[PDB]
Amino acid sequence: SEISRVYEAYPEKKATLYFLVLGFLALIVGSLFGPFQALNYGNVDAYPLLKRLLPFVQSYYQGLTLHGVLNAIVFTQLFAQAIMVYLPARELNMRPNMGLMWLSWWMAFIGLVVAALPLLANEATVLYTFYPPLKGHWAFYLGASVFVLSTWVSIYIVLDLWRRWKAANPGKVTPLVTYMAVVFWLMWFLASLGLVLEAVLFLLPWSFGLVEGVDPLVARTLFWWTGHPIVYFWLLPAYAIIYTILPKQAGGRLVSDPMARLAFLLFLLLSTPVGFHHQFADPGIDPTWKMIHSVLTLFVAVPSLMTAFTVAASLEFAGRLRGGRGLFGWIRALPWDNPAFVAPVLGLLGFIPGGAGGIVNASFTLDYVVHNTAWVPGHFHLQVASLVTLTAMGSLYWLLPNLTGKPISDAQRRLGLAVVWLWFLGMMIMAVGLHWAGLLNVPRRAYIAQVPDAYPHAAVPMVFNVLAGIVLLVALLLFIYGLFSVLLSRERKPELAEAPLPFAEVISGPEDRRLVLAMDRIGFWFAVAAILVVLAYGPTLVQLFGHLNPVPGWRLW
Amino acid sequence: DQHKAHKAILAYEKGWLAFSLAMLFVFIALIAYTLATHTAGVIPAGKLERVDPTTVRQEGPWADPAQAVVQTGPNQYTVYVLAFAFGYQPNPIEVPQGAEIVFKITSPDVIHGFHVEGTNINVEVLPGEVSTVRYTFKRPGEYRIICNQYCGLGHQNMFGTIVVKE
Amino acid sequence: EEKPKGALAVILVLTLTILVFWLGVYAVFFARG
Numbered sequence: 001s002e003i004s005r006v007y008e009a010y011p012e013k014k015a016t017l018y019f020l021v022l023g024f025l026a027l028i029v030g031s032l033f034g035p036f037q038a039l040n041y042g043n044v045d046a047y048p049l050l051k052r053l054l055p056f057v058q059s060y061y062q063g064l065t066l067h068g069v070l071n072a073i074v075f076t077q078l079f080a081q082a083i084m085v086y087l088p089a090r091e092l093n094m095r096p097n098m099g100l101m102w103l104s105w106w107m108a109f110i111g112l113v114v115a116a117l118p119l120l121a122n123e124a125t126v127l128y129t130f131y132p133p134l135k136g137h138w139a140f141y142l143g144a145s146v147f148v149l150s151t152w153v154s155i156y157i158v159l160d161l162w163r164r165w166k167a168a169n170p171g172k173v174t175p176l177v178t179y180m181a182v183v184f185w186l187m188w189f190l191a192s193l194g195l196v197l198e199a200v201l202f203l204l205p206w207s208f209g210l211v212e213g214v215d216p217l218v219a220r221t222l223f224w225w226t227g228h229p230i231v232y233f234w235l236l237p238a239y240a241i242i243y244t245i246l247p248k249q250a251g252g253r254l255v256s257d258p259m260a261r262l263a264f265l266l267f268l269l270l271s272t273p274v275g276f277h278h279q280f281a282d283p284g285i286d287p288t289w290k291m292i293h294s295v296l297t298l299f300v301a302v303p304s305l306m307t308a309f310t311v312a313a314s315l316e317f318a319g320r321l322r323g324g325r326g327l328f329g330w331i332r333a334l335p336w337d338n339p340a341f342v343a344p345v346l347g348l349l350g351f352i353p354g355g356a357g358g359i360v361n362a363s364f365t366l367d368y369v370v371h372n373t374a375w376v377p378g379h380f381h382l383q384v385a386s387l388v389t390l391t392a393m394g395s396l397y398w399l400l401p402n403l404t405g406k407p408i409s410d411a412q413r414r415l416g417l418a419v420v421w422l423w424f425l426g427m428m429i430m431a432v433g434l435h436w437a438g439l440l441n442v443p444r445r446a447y448i449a450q451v452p453d454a455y456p457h458a459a460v461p462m463v464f465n466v467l468a469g470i471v472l473l474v475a476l477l478l479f480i481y482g483l484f485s486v487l488l489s490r491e492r493k494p495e496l497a498e499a500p501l502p503f504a505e506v507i508s509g510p511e512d513r514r515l516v517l518a519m520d521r522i523g524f525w526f527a528v529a530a531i532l533v534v535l536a537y538g539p540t541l542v543q544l545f546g547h548l549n550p551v552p553g554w555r556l557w
Numbered sequence: 558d559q560h561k562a563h564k565a566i567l568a569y570e571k572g573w574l575a576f577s578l579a580m581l582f583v584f585i586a587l588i589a590y591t592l593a594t595h596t597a598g599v600i601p602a603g604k605l606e607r608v609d610p611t612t613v614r615q616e617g618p619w620a621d622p623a624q625a626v627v628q629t630g631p632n633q634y635t636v637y638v639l640a641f642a643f644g645y646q647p648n649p650i651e652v653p654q655g656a657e658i659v660f661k662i663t664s665p666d667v668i669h670g671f672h673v674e675g676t677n678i679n680v681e682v683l684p685g686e687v688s689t690v691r692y693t694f695k696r697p698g699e700y701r702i703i704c705n706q707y708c709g710l711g712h713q714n715m716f717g718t719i720v721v722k723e
Numbered sequence: 724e725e726k727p728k729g730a731l732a733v734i735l736v737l738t739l740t741i742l743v744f745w746l747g748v749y750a751v752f753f754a755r756g
């Protein structure tokens with residue numbers, strides 16, 4: 001059948017790849033509006049240009065929407081069904097089932113494709129949060145509905161591949177990568193009901209025309225169930241990558257197996273019971289629970305902290321191995337010639353400011369300082385346009401060989417970082433701007449270019465955003481040339497491809513085994529996780545479900 | 558170095574979880590110090606106070622914008638703010654200085670914000686619910702009201718004023 | 724050898740930016756009391 005026995009030995013590189021292509025396409029299109037939306041916050045109107053290049057756009061806010069669905073829902077979703085199946089699958093030399101594994105990919109193309117339409121046609125300009133009563137063509141709600149449900153097929157693929165292993169390595173622990181994704185797909189299933197009970201019972205009949213109204217307090221409470229974990233649905237993949245992979249491409253080893261397990265363990269507990277941080281400014285939602293979720297939210301920042309230690313430690317150990325030496329001698333010992341290794345390490349620098357961000361935001365009342373200002377678009381860009389994205393972009397160089405064949409000549413190695421270093425610097429410059437205007441009260445989510453006399457104390461951050469627009473346009477464009485060029489010029493030469501992708505390995509101890517053994521109560525911790533949700537959203541969700549107060553729809557563009 | 562090294566990690570790790578879990582409660586704590594003093598009123602009312610958005614600009618204290626600063630204590634003043642597809646009723650809102658404004662806001666159409674600029678007042682306003690907050694402007698003048706919530710293409714243009722009379 | 728000097732220099736900073744941020748903010752909260 002094949003002049004590439006490539007997809008008969010293993011076609012987990014036949015499915016996955018289509019995941020990442022779709023992914024890295026969504027990230028290109030949606031990111032497309034980026035620096036346009038960038039100069040807006042820079043106080044220069046760019047849309048007269050953009051509307052004419054792509055003549056299909058009508059609002060600033062329509063782009064805002066493309067950029068939002070196509071970067072944050074589609075691109076991150078895809079990149080996790082990629083990694084989060086492919087890796088464990090390989091760390092076990094097992095093939096994921098392929099009715100299902102090919103079905104899930106149809107779900108995503110089917111979905112996005114259906115949605116994409118309204119969205120281009122400006123029939124659905126309600127933004128990636130799509131807050132009723134802003135009402136979006138029935139066809140959009142069906143998009144996310146299936147597309148996001150495509151994460152239900154894949155949960156299986158993993159958990160299938162869990163069952164079969166331990167039916168054949170029975171009485172052996174769970175190998176790390178697998179152990180990670182297991183909980184991750186379980187956690188994501190706890191979160192995946194939020195938006196799913198919201199789509200089904202409310203969104204769909206409404207937008208279908210089977211009710212004139214929805215209750216937008218509950219409409220946004222189900223969203224925020226799903227809508228927080230979903231950031232940690234975007235993160236943990238790059239965490240996965242950084243835990244198991246990074247230390248290798250970077251010359252070294254995972255300093256602890258179980259720290260890394262623990263880190264994920266607390267992410268299936270605390271990823272979901274934490275929606276009110278986003279609902280701080282709602283009415284009708286008791287002050288007490290805002291406090292709860294706020295304590296809880298600070299809890300969920302405790303994984304990423306030790307991560308901060310376990311990772312930096314690794315790179316440190318690795319740094320010394322390459323005769324790094326000075327207090328900081330360890331840093332330049334790192335493979336700063338390698339995009340594989342640069343993108344997520346710059347990811348993690350980035351992660352620091354963006355880190356504290358979350359925590360300011362996370363403390364109840366300190367949200368009233370920053371909430372809905374541009375401060376927000378500051379924090380998340382730092383976290384997800386930057387870390388998750390760079391970790392993804394950078395994955396090009398070890399994943400895409402492993403997957404197609406096609407090695408990466410010194411030229412690619414050059415573009416490589418030209419892209420990455422421009423990306424980062426862009427994300428850093430755009431960071432201070434967005435974060436600063438944020439404190440001078442420039443609202444987020446706004447076409448502020450059309451009122452370019454209104455934020456006169458933004459004068460200067462403003463510049464920062466202008467500049468970051470130029471920078472990051474320069475870097476998108478290299479990325480296109482460096483995406484289509486590491487794919488399409490023809491080195492589908494034989495050998496290399498085949499692999500264990502560089503896993504790293506671990507340091508070991510006495511203490512390990514006792515701990516590693518307790519974190520394997522997957523059914524058990526799935527329970528406290530599911531005790532925790534029901535304990536926290538339950539006593540509020542009951543309430544409002546009794547004062548369901550539906551109000552009419554609205555188109556308003 | 559190497560399995561030896563590994564031990565030292567597992568106690569540093571421990572310091573990290575120790576020190577770090579700490580400063581977090583300091584925060585949980587500091588928060589609670591705000592949580593018990595005047596600056597706490599900018600926190601939306603507990604209760605649902607339900608309304609019927611499609612009627613509220615026609616009947617209810619939100620119908621007449623002229624009589625929407627109702628005195629309510631010797632120093633309390635309820636304001637009935639309405640926040641609609643594309644401004645604030647009323648423009649402006651005049652309140653006295655040194656005194657307790659209890660804002661009560663609602664939507665007749667879609668969602669809006671109401672971030673009274675220079676203050677903590679910063680609340681999502683939802684059709685058919687009544688967002689309710691306390692504030693005291695201790696020092697008077699003009700305060701612009703920005704809508705920080707997308708609500709369609711009037712959005713980047715939705716402002717209004719608080720005048721607080723010297 | 725002996726010391727994770729580095730990894731802390733990293734968290735020390737990670738801490739000092741959590742502090743600068745949180746404390747900086749807090750005060751804006753209050754400056755807007």
Ligand code: HAS
Pocket residue numbers: 129231232234235277278297298300301302304305307308309311312315331345348349351352354355356357358359360361362363367370371372376379380383384388733737
């Ligand atoms: C993918 C992405 C995201 C991650 C990850 C993320 C992490 C957090 N966030 Fe967030 N966020 C909030 C709180 C947090 C907290 C407490 C964390 C925590 O999980 C983060 C803990 C992180 C740290 C403690 C940093 C650890 C640092 C590390 C690990 C770097 C180490 C560097 C090394 C090791 C380098 C070493 C190498 C060398 C070479 C030196 C809150 C408040 O509670 C809001 C509400 C704002 C509002 O008003 O709407 C919010 C709003 C958002 C929104 C806006 C949603 C919307 O559009 O309406 C998005 C998209 C988002 C994404 C993400 N966020 N966030």
Ligand code: HEM
Pocket residue numbers: 027031034035036037038041064067068071072075127128129374377381384385386388389430443444445446447468469472473476
């Ligand atoms: C090319 C570089 C990028 C630039 C210049 C950029 C710029 C911006 C700006 C200025 C905003 C604020 C818009 C507003 O508040 O009105 C924004 C929103 C957003 N960006 Fe990006 N961005 C970039 C890349 C990315 C990437 C790679 C992701 C994927 C993780 C992403 C995800 C988002 C999301 C989820 C929003 C919020 C949507 C909303 O407000 O409803 N961005 N972007």
Ligand code: CUA
Pocket residue numbers: 641643668669670704705706707708709711712713715
């Ligand atoms: Cu009302 Cu934006």
Ligand SMILES: [Cu+]
Pocket residue numbers: 227228229231277278
């Ligand atoms: Cu969140």
